[PDB]
Amino acid sequence: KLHKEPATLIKAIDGDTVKLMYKGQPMTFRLLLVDTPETKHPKKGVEKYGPEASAFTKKMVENAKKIEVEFDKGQRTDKYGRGLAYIYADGKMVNEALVRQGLAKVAYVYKANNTHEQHLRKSEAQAKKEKLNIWS
C-alpha cells in the first residue's frame, strides 16, 4: 500500500505545484486529484482565487517542520516530468486542506491514482455547503 517519504521544500510554485528535493534531486510536484485556480495559467490570466490558493499552499509548506510525499498506485510522473503525489506538511495533507478550504476542486482521476479521491470528495462537499471561497 502507499507510504510517505521525506522531502525538502525548495520553492512553492503555484497553488497546485511545488518544487522539492526528493531523494537528493530537485523535482517539480503536481498535487494529485486537485484543481486550483491558476496564477501561472498558459491561456487565461490570473484566475479568481488564484493568489489565495498560491498563498495557502506556500504558507503551509514553508511553515512546516517535515514535508512528506506520497505517490499513489498509478503513474508517478505526468507528461511534463512532474511527480504526481499527495503532499503532507506536518502530517496534514496539503491536497485535502486546499479542497476543505474551498480553494480547489477535486480533479479527474489520472491513471489509477485515486486512493484518496473519496476522502477529498467529502471535504469538497463540505466546503461548498459552507460556501467557502470558490463556492461563494
Curated annotation (Swiss-Prot):
The active site is at R30, E38, R82. Residues 116-132 have a biased composition (Basic and acidic residues). It is found in: Secreted. Ca(2+) binds at D16, D35, T36. Residues 116-136 are annotated as: Disordered. Disulfide bonds: none annotated. This is Nuclease A. It comes from Staphylococcus aureus. The lineage of its organism: Bacteria, Bacillati, Bacillota, Bacilli, Bacillales. The chain holds residues 88 to 223 of 231 of the full protein.
